[PDB]
Structures are given as structure tokens and as C-alpha cells.
Amino acid sequence: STELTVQSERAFQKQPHIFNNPKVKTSKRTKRWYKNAGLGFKTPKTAIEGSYIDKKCPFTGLVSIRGKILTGTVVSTKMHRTIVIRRAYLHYIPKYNRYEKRHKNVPVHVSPAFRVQVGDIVTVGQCRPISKTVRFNVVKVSAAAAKANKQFAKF
Amino acid sequence: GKGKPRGLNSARKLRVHRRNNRWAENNYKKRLLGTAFKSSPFGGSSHAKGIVLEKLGIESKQPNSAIRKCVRVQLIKNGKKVTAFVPNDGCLNFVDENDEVLLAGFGRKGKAKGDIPGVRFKVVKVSGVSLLALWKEKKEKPRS
Amino acid sequence: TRSSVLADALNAINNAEKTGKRQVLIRPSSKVIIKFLQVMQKHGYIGEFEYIDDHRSGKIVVQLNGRLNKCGVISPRFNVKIGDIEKWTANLLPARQFGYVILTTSAGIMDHEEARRKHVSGKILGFVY
Amino acid sequence: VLVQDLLHPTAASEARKHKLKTLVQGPRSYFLDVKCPGCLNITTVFSHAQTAVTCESCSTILCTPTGGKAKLSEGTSFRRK
Amino acid sequence: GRMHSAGKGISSSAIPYSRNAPAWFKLSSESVIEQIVKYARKGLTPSQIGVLLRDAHGVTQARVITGNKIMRILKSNGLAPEIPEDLYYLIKKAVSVRKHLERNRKDKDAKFRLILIESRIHRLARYYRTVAVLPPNWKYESATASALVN
Amino acid sequence: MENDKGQLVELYVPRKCSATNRIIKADDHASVQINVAKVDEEGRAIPGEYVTYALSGYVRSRGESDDSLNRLAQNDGLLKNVWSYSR
RNA sequence: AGGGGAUCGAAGAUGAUCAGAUACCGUCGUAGUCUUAACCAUAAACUAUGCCGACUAGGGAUCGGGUGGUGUUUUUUUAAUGACCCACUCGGCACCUUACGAGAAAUCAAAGUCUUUGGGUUCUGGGGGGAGUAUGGUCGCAAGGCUGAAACUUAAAGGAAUUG
RNA sequence: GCGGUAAUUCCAGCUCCAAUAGCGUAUAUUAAAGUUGUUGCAGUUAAAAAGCUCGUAGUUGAACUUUGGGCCCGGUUGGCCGGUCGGAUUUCCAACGGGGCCUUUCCUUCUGGCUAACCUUGAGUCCUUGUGGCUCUUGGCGAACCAGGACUUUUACUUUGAAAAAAUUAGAGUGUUCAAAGCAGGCGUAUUGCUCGAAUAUAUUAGCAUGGAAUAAUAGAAUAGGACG
RNA sequence: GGAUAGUGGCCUACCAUGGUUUCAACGGGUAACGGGGAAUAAGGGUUCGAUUCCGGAGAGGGAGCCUGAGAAACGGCUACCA
Numbered sequence A: 001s002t003e004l005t006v007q008s009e010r011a012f013q014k015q016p017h018i019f020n021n022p023k024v025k026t027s028k029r030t031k032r033w034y035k036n037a038g039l040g041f042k043t044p045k046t047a048i049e050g051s052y053i054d055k056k057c058p059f060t061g062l063v064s065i066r067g068k069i070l071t072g073t074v075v076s077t078k079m080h081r082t083i084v085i086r087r088a089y090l091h092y093i094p095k096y097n098r099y100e101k102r103h104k105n106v107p108v109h110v111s112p113a114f115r116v117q118v119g120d121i122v123t124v125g126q127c128r129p130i131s132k133t134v135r136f137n138v139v140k141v142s143a144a145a146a147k148a149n150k151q152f153a154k155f
Numbered sequence B: 001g002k003g004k005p006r007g008l009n010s011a012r013k014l015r016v017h018r019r020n021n022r023w024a025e026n027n028y029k030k031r032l033l034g035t036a037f038k039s040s041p042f043g044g045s046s047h048a049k050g051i052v053l054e055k056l057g058i059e060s061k062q063p064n065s066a067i068r069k070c071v072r073v074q075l076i077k078n079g080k081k082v083t084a085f086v087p088n089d090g091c092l093n094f095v096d097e098n099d100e101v102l103l104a105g106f107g108r109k110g111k112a113k114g115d116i117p118g119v120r121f122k123v124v125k126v127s128g129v130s131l132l133a134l135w136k137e138k139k140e141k142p143r144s
Numbered sequence C: 001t002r003s004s005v006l007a008d009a010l011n012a013i014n015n016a017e018k019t020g021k022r023q024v025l026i027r028p029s030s031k032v033i034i035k036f037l038q039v040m041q042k043h044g045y046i047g048e049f050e051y052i053d054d055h056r057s058g059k060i061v062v063q064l065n066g067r068l069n070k071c072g073v074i075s076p077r078f079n080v081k082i083g084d085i086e087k088w089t090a091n092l093l094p095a096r097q098f099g100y101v102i103l104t105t106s107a108g109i110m111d112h113e114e115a116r117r118k119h120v121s122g123k124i125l126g127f128v129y
Numbered sequence D: 001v002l003v004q005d006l007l008h009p010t011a012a013s014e015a016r017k018h019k020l021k022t023l024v025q026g027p028r029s030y031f032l033d034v035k036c037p038g039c040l041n042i043t044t045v046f047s048h049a050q051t052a053v054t055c056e057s058c059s060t061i062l063c064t065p066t067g068g069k070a071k072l073s074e075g076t077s078f079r080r081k
Numbered sequence E: 001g002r003m004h005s006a007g008k009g010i011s012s013s014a015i016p017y018s019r020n021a022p023a024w025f026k027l028s029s030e031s032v033i034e035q036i037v038k039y040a041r042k043g044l045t046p047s048q049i050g051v052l053l054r055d056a057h058g059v060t061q062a063r064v065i066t067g068n069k070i071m072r073i074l075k076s077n078g079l080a081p082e083i084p085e086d087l088y089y090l091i092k093k094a095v096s097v098r099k100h101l102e103r104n105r106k107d108k109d110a111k112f113r114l115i116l117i118e119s120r121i122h123r124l125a126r127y128y129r130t131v132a133v134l135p136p137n138w139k140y141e142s143a144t145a146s147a148l149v150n
Numbered sequence F: 001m002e003n004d005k006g007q008l009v010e011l012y013v014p015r016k017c018s019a020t021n022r023i024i025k026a027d028d029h030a031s032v033q034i035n036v037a038k039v040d041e042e043g044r045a046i047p048g049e050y051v052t053y054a055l056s057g058y059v060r061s062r063g064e065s066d067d068s069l070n071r072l073a074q075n076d077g078l079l080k081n082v083w084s085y086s087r
Numbered sequence G: 001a002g003g004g005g006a007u008c009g010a011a012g013a014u015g016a017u018c019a020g021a022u023a024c025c026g027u028c029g030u031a032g033u034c035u036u037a038a039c040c041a042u043a044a045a046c047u048a049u050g051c052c053g054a055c056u057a058g059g060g061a062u063c064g065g066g067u068g069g070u071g072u073u074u075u076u077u078u079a080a081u082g083a084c085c086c087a088c089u090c091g092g093c094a095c096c097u098u099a100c101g102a103g104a105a106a107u108c109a110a111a112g113u114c115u116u117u118g119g120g121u122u123c124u125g126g127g128g129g130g131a132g133u134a135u136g137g138u139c140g141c142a143a144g145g146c147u148g149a150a151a152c153u154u155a156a157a158g159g160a161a162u163u164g
Numbered sequence H: 001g002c003g004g005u006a007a008u009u010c011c012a013g014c015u016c017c018a019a020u021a022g023c024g025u026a027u028a029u030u031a032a033a034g035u036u037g038u039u040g041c042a043g044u045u046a047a048a049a050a051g052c053u054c055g056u057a058g059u060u061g062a063a064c065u066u067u068g069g070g071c072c073c074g075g076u077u078g079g080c081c082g083g084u085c086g087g088a089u090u091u092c093c094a095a096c097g098g099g100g101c102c103u104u105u106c107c108u109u110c111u112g113g114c115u116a117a118c119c120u121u122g123a124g125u126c127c128u129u130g131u132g133g134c135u136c137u138u139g140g141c142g143a144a145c146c147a148g149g150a151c152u153u154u155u156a157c158u159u160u161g162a163a164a165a166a167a168u169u170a171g172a173g174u175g176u177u178c179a180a181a182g183c184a185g186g187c188g189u190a191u192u193g194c195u196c197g198a199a200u201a202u203a204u205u206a207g208c209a210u211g212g213a214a215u216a217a218u219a220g221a222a223u224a225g226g227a228c229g
Numbered sequence I: 001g002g003a004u005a006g007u008g009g010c011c012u013a014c015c016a017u018g019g020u021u022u023c024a025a026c027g028g029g030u031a032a033c034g035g036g037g038a039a040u041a042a043g044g045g046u047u048c049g050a051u052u053c054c055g056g057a058g059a060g061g062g063a064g065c066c067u068g069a070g071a072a073a074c075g076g077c078u079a080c081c082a
Ligand SMILES: [Mg+2]
Pocket: A078, A079, A080, I016, I017, I018
């Protein structure tokens, strides 16, 4: 989520060991590192064009993506730089030979390279433990908004 | 179709609904309340051993006429006080007050036998030996 | 309101038979109804039928003989796993020697024997004898 | 009964049925061309009106609405198509 | 059928097989579409138009002689109203019914009807809302509705 | 209803309704077999020589015996008019 | 809580009746009975029969709508009307006869299309008594409403039809 | 249900039954029980439809969009021969299935690598009068999949498969004297060894991998903020 | 940042206001260790598993710790309670 200020903490936000020599007069001020997480996920330009710092970003930060790759729909965006998705699924009861609707809510970190709204289907990649509960990271937005601009005024 | 949802996802309704109506089953409710362990003289166990308080003379129910010869027993593990039947001709001669006896069920899932009213148990042994053997002659009652 | 459109068609057919009749106008037809009516016809239980064309959902006239005892629908299309098909026909077919459970697989609406011969499975539709 | 033709039923029994239970449903209303010889031209009118239809030039009348078919007004003619 | 009553009335236009034609219909697309918009401009409802165009003129169905439902022709010419027509006529009813209930607190049956009317409103809205014709967050409110219809 | 090697097993293959082709089973003591006689050149009813039809008790029970008879005979050649396939 | 309080009339008092007669029958008559403002939320609130959809069988009446007619009656100058009549067609409240079918039966055009058992969905029951009792929760000014057990007891309670 | 004086139920004697190195009893549970009912219950009168309607969660929800037709390839059972020294394969034939084509038909897509395949043909020919047959390089198939870039509406179902403890369970082999078992054992030159075993199946719900495209969902282009260049 | 073998509200500062729930959160009960499995045989089920194998937990109850590669060990120590 981040937005504005970027240098808004008590500590200086920077990328580890990405020294920029001040002697060397340069036109871009800050040298910035990045990668592609692989598995086929484009490292969106807003990660390379970005100036945010998030060490928990899978493109600009020091996290690796491995283990389960999951999709689920976004249902909470109130946590600064993280969200809560719901993954629905039917569950088979034998004896009755039918299923029942179930769900779980997975908490997952979301880098300022994505701009996620409630309702967006999102794909996340499993993580090293990143917080008390978050074990996933938003790796791609599948959605958009859900035709919001096609909710405008009158003729 | 009457009642029961036929749907392909209605499993949850279908289970819950059952859960609910199992309670109308006398054995399922008994099991889960633990009526066995809670109420009921015996611990839940099959027999239990107590001490003889008074020799009684229960008069049978109609259309029977009899005096039915029983013992009030105080269950050892329990203190709970219970009246028990002493079967076969005599045998009330075998017991005596303050003697130990091994009570057992009557084979009716709780519930009294026939014309004996109130009695839900029967005597099986006294002073560690067995009414049955005593009744015959295969064994003898212990010292004191 | 109208639930399984296959249900009404099947039912109407059965009552036309039971009343000793030789035709049913059925409504409102559907891909699935034809493909079902199609499998009966393939095996003798009805005659020829006819799609009439109101510019709506359709009507079908079925001509039937009397070879047919019952043709029901399985109201929730349960899944069937190549082995459970044994257990289905066993439950609702009068003998091992004839009669068909018709169902729906990835490779088309087909009776259980063509289903067994092609070695595919899927969901369960209805049945014929 | 027991055996008949559902496909090609008699014109008359089909005729008497409800407009929704015919073999393929259709209307049973019609349109007409109406005159009131003060004028020379002819408005096209639907057999069922709701709107009390007025003629081209003169505020005259034509028909009044009813429960079904409109009551045409006094001195008028009509063909059907 | 019949949502808010135990009525079982079947009753509807029985549309013709003839998806085109009438053949004896002269005029033209041009002819009628203009006729639509002029009436839409008088403030007529697409329904009112169809009816008016049905009897007086020979417009068997507007969608035929022009492959286009009357409402879409209106939208296309900018004549579409804020909220849909049926939605409108429901609200307008609940406003008259309410006005009556203010004036007659003793009428329990009005109270009962209002519920019904409003239930239908509230449900209809949510359909329209779902399919984006009404802004997500639209809402019929008793207070505000009277200013809404008029 | 054959067997392992050919061999007609299981007795009594029953009759059948000419109207409905349902089985005409034994205790159906309400069904009927109608023998319509073959005629020759100028009257003359040719004893023992019929066109026959069998109608299940059910069918006569339902009253459909006289209509279904008509259809059968007519479209078999011994009526012309009387019946109409359409209604 | 105001009003109203003709009538009939819980309660009460009586006259008779009775072995008794706190009753039935008669008299007096408080509350009530009506109304406004507010509560209460229960009736054998019953069709003791959930709603939506389909299919399966005959008949005559009737209620509302409609359509058809060189129908009757209304006179005037024919109509126009209206009322009536006859055939159909939707949707009503019902009755009749059958019953392919269903049921333990009485009976049932649904209580049918069910061991040839699956259109969709809601709710309730699981022997009898204990008992709609105890308890907690909750609603109510109250009376009471909703939710609502167990111990213990018991071999039947019950339904429909038959003969007495 | 028997017993209140001829007790077919008690207490015995005799005789008789059932199971028998075992048989009774008490408690629990399972079958019977379609008396918990998904399969599969019952609710007019037997226990049971909420006084009534509205209504959210929940479950459920009409029809309609590549169908039809033509061509090739190669299988596995079965027949009628058997050619052959019990099983064999070609032609004849049906039958049931898998693959790929062309019918206006994305197969994600470009940039080579690769080619197995004929529109080829370059010669002609073993041999039945020849399209019966495969070797065979010099113009002319993509997809069979490598790998790099650039992107991809979501699901449910079902298929085959991988990964997978043993003992238990099902079950093959083996004569523990039989058997419950066990996993041994079997053959000779029984003086100097020979040898078969120690299978298979189930292993589901979830996860992974692959084939399918019916049934059932989902998203798409209407203030064009559309689609291809 | 500190701590740890190391991720992590694990702990601490600062900052924010979030996380779960009728698809049953939270709470209560269990005469609850979980599995491999056991009992019952048309099928669907119903009941059971302290107990020969795998996992986990404990050593009268709690806490703490020394040694050590490995223990918060108990046929090790220290303390409190019994
Ligand atoms: Mg926050």
C-alpha cells in the first residue's frame, strides 16, 4: 500500500548493499536492484520504475517464492502492505455423497508494485514466514477492478 | 420430494439435520449425555459390589400375589443405596445383614424385571462365593 | 418453478406409456432431452420423435410402442467414478442382462455400456427399461 | 384418444383453443384500415386499442377501448391487413 | 408464478412466429425510429410509445421493423431516464401508498401492501445494481424517494 | 428366451395387446381376442379364417376398446372412413 | 389511560330444584361487551392436509374476464344499448361419477405418477407417561408468550375398519 | 405368562432337546432397523405443517453458441478357414473401440533448432496381366519438443498416472502330519550342489501429473475506455 | 533493533487500526492422545481403537537449569508445593 513520503520511517529505508557512490555524479540518484521471481511471473514495471522499499517484495526485496502457488479473491485491504483473501472450495462429504461450501482466509503480503482493491482475483506465492500469520505473497493480479468506470454518471 | 433437500451441495444441511434428530434416539442421547456415568447406581460398569443393609419382603405386582425377598445394598465405590433381588428358593437364608454381595443387572436395560417393583438388580454372590453354588451344595459360606 | 427440464420430459413419457397411449407432446425440449430421447430410440424403447419449432425453447412429439416400463431421471447429477457405475445399475436396473443407465461424460451423453466400452465416466443423468 | 396426431391436428379444434395452447403460439389480434368519409385517407388500427385512436387531420374519434377489441365509432368502414 | 400473491393467472402477449415482415407494412426503419424519439421527447415511456405506436400507427413490434428494442433506441439517442421504467413505477407507487399511510395510520392493509411493494423494489434494485445499470451503492430510501420520482 | 446353446427354455411366451403391446398375462381374465372373419366373392364368410386382434383388459377397462379397434381394422383394410388419425 | 356504558352479561347475591346443588333453569347485576391511545400474540387461528413446477380422467352447474352469432326479449323507424340464450376459452369458490392409481383403512384428482423407491425447497415427528413439568435465557405492566430437559416409571398407549 | 390341590412354567425323580471342552449370566456395541431413512422413513385421522404473509443467510434455478457430412491410419477381441510342427499370421468378413485429417474451423505466439511424416521423384522394380512393396538423395508438412523472448478469463467433474511403511485386510505360491499359522521350501551325485520363491490387488479425501470438453458455474463489447494493423 | 541455530509479535521500541465469525467464530463439554487399524458381513452405513508399528506427550505436581553434538532429561541437578 505504502504511497508518498517513501523515506517516512525512523530508520533510513534503503536496499541492502546497493551502494551509490556520491563521488560519481549520476543521473538517477538511486541505484535499484530487482529480479524475476521466476515460475513465469512478470516482474511488473512498477517494481523497476518504483522507489518504494519493501524488503518483503518478491521482485525488489529479499524473499524467495517457492512452495504452493494459490489463487483467491481479495476481501480485505485495510492492512498496510498486506491483504486478506478468501479461498472458497466445496468439501466432499461421503455418506451423503455431496459437497458443502467451505472457505479459508489467507493473509498475504502485498508489494506497492501492485494496486489491489477488494474483489480482485489475485495469485500468491508461498513464502518464508514473513509475519506471525502471513506465509504468502501477492505475485500477480488476475483481475482489474470489476468494470468500475462503467458505473459513472448519466447521459 | 418432501423435506430432505436433494441438492448436490446440500451436504451440510443434510448432516446437521441428522445430528439434530439423533437426539430423538434413546440410546444416542443416553450415550452422549453419559447417563451411564452420571445417574444410574452402577458406575456404568457391568456389576458392582456392595453391603447388605436390610432384608426386605417386597410384595409382587398384580395379577401376581407373592412376597419377593430382596436386599437393600449400599454400593461400595459409590455409597449409593440400592434394592436387589435374591433369586431361587431360599437364598434369603444365605445372605444376612452387613454381608458383602455382588450385584448385577436384570437384563432389561435398567428397568425392573416382572412383578418385582423397583428392583433393577439381582444378587450373584455373597461372601465371595455365588448364590448359585450355595443353592446347590457345591460350595459353602465363609467363616465370618 | 421449472427445475430439471429433463425431469418433466421423462415423466410425461412414462405417464403416456402408463395410460397406454402412443404419443407425448413434451415441452420445452433441450439439447440434453434430445440426446436422451436419442439414446432410448437407439435401443428400441421409443419410436421416432420430432422437434417442433415454436420460436421459443421447443416442443417434441415422441412416438412410443409399449416396450418401455420406466424412464426416470437422477435428480442430482451425482458424480460416478468408473467403478461406482457397477453399483448404480445394480441399484436401479431390473437384471444384469438388459436395461441401461444413461449418464453424461466428457465424451458425450451415453448409456453405461457404451460408457464402459469407451472407458470414460462422469455424471449420472437418468435410466431406461 | 390413446392414438392420434399431435403433429397435424384439425384446424378447428386448434382454432377454438387458447392462443397459448395452440401447437405454436401466435396472436389472434389483427390490424385494420379505417375510414370516416369526411377524409380520404385511412389510418391503420390495432384490433385492441387502449388508446382511443384519433384520425390523421380531424379530431374526430375512430374507436374506443374496451376489455378486448375496440368499439369502432359509428360511421366507419374497415378492411383487415 | 405470481411473486407477491397466490394468483395463478397465465396471461401474456403471444408473440408471432413471423420474426420479420409484415410485408403489408410499408414505411421504413427511418420512419419509425424518428417516430419513437419524437414521442420519447414528449416524455413518453418506451411502453407508452409501443402502445401508442401499436394502435394509431402500424407498429406490430418495434423490434422487428428495426432490429432494436424501444429502450435501446432511446438510450442511443440519449433519451434514457436515470433509473429504469419499471423501477420508477414501483417507487412512485410506494410513494403514493406511503403518503396514504401517513394520512391513515389506522389502515393496517396499506402497511402490509407497502412492505410488499418495497420488497419488490428492494429486490429489483439489487438486480439492476448487480448488472451495473445502477451504481453499486444505489438505495431506495423512503425519505428521499418522493423527491426522486418527482 | 433361449439358453447357453440355443435351446428354447422357459415355457409360455404370452400373447400381446394389438393396441398397446403390453403382455396379456394369465389372470387378465378381462382381456379379449376378437376374430373378424375373412369374406369372399359375394357375402360368404369362409368359416375358420379370420383377421384377429387381441386387446388387453386394461384397454377395454379404459373404454379405449372401440376406438382402438377402429384404428386397427381400418388401417388393416376392413374399414374406410369411421376413423380419423387426427383430432 | 380517557371516553361510552342501550344491550347481553365471567364475579357476586338470590328464587327454586337436589340426599347434596358452590351448577344446569329464574332474578338482581360488578367487570366486560362499543371507542380512542397503547399493550398482549394466543384459538379445534382446521381443509386437523407447506410453497413453486410438471404430468395423469370424465360430467353438469356457477363467479369474474374475453371472443364468436343473418340467437331470444326490449320498439321507434331500424338500430345503438342493456338483460337474456347458445358454443368456446382463461383464471375462481365448489359439487357429481369414476378410479388407471394410492392407502391400515375411512377415504383421496391428490392423500396419484413410491422396493420399476430422486424436479426444487421449507418445517416438524421417532413408543407411552413423566410434561410442555424442572431449569437457564428472553419478551411482557400483568396474565403469560418463545425457547425447553432429565431422573424415574411403563407393555402398551394409539389409528382405521368389523362383529356384538 | 405360570402358582389359590388332578401346576404342559415352581421343588424334585424319570425320560427328552440344543450347543459340547466348553455352556449360562450381567454390561456395552453391531446386525435385525426402511425404529435416524444419501441409498431409504413418517407427518388428513396413528407421534409430526410454524395463525398468516414478507424476507436475509442457505439450498435451488428455462431454453439457446461446431453440429452434420467426406477421407485416411493403426490397434483387440470374435468368426471362417491353418500354413504348422497345443499356438502361429495374412487375405475375406463382420463388432467394438483409439488417432489424425478436409469441410469458412488457434494449434498461445513469434525467432531456429529436429525434423517423423508426403503434396514429393530420383531411378526403377522383388513379383500374381499392377499403386499389392521398402530401401532410396537434389525444389516441396510442422509442432513430435527442445529454449529464449513476448502473453495467457477463472472453476467444478471425470480418466489414466506418479509419489507412496510394514503388520492387518483381499489374495498367489508352498502339503506346518491337518489346521490356526509360517514364509518357507523343493531337487540330486544325499563325498564337498542344484534350484523356484519371498507375488498381486485395495491404498478414495487433499496435494501433484495427464487425457477428455458432455453436464454445471465464471469472465467478455453498449456513454465503445472495444477488436485485430 | 534485540534475542535465537535460524524465519517469525518470538520479545522491545515507535507507528497504525487491524485479525476471526451463521460456510458457526469465541466459549463449553469429552468417562479425547492421533494415525496404521478393530467389530459388525447385500450395499449405503454404525460403533470402536489405553493397548505389539509410526507420530506425540509425560515421569507425583509446577518452574528452573548444568553438562552436552543432542535434554528444558528426571533411574541429572536446584527451588517451591504435596
Ligand atoms: Mg494498519
